[PDB]
Amino acid sequence: LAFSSWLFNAKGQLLVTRRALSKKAWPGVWTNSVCGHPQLGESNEDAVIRRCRYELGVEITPPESIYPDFRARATDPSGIVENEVCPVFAARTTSALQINDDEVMDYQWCDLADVLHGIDATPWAFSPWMVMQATNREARKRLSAFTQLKL
Numbered sequence: 001l002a003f004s005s006w007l008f009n010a011k012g013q014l015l016v017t018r019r020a021l022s023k024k025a026w027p028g029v030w031t032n033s034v035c036g037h038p039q040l041g042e043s044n045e046d047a048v049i050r051r052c053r054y055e056l057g058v059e060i061t062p063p064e065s066i067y068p069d070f071r072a073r074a075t076d077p078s079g080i081v082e083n084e085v086c087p088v089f090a091a092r093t094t095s096a097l098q099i100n101d102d103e104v105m106d107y108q109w110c111d112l113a114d115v116l117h118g119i120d121a122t123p124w125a126f127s128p129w130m131v132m133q134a135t136n137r138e139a140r141k142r143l144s145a146f147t148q149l150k151l
C-alpha cells in the first residue's frame with residue numbers, strides 16, 4: 001500500500017528529486033517528486049500532503065488522482081524487492097521547498113518534455129516506478145496538464 005506524487009510549481013515546471021544515499025531502497029536514484037505509505041486510517045490524499053511536508057517542507061494544492069490503478073513490483077540495484085499498490089497523484093507547490101536531506105540529496109526544477117525525453121531514451125537512469133508511471137498514456141496526459149502556467 002503506497003502512493004506516488006508528481007509536483008509542479010505554478011510556472012508548470014516539474015520537480016524531480018534524487019533519493020538520499022541512505023535510503024534502503026533505490027538510494028542515490030533520480031525519481032518523481034515524492035513517494036511513500038499512508039498510515040492506518042489515513043487517506044492517500046492526506047498521506048501525499050503529509051509526505052510533501054516531511055520530505056520537501058512544502059505546501060501543495062489538492063492532490064489530483066492521475067493513475068489510481070498503478071501497482072507494480074520492482075527490484076532495486078541491490079535486490080530489494082518491492083511490490084506495491086501505488087496510486088499516483090499530481091499537485092502544485094504553493095510555498096518554497098525546504099529540503100529534508102535524510103530523504104533527498106538533490107532535486108531539479110525541469111521542463112516535463114525534457115524529463116519525458118530522458119525517461120524514454122535512458123530509462124535505466126531513473127527509478128523504475130517513475131518510468132512505469134510516466135509511460136502510462138493517461139497519466140502522461142495529466143502530467144502535461146500540470147505544465148500550464150497558473151497565475
Ligand SMILES: [Mg+2]
Binds near residue numbers: 034103
Ligand atoms: Mg518517500
